[PDB]
Amino acid sequence: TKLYCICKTPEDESKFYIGCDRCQNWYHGRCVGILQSEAELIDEYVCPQCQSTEDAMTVLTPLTEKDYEGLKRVLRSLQAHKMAWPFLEPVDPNDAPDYYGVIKEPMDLATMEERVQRRYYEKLTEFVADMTKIFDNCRYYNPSDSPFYQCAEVLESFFVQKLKGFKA
């Protein structure tokens, strides 16, 4: 006799169970929020804890071939965005001296494209960090009511949605 589910109880044949394909434990459908009628519609089942781990590890796993191609498509979508104009290329040292006096880790979409090309990134978190740097640098350097700051707000919102469901 083994103990199963998050509730740690022995098997009761009068209750509905669903098996997790990742950890191989069994769960009462009632304890994990899934009814028999709903279970019929899914091929594999991943329990809540295993799913939380899978969701969290998406940004830490190795970037695959397909991931890299996907990153290129994500960059292309941002590059075509109306609010991406301040972030397409590095700030021109000649248009703006003190920009580089205070930003030592600048970032832009063209530089990110180069980094994706040469596979500088090896985990999604690294790509997301560079993207976030583009927006954080902008918000650090410009007033919140300024067009530059707000473009970062808009594009970051667009970015977050674009990245939904990115990893296989």
Partner: peptide, 6 residues
């Protein structure tokens, strides 16, 4: 999915 029902 793998299940156990009555």
């Amino acid at each position: 999915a793998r299940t156990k029902q009555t």
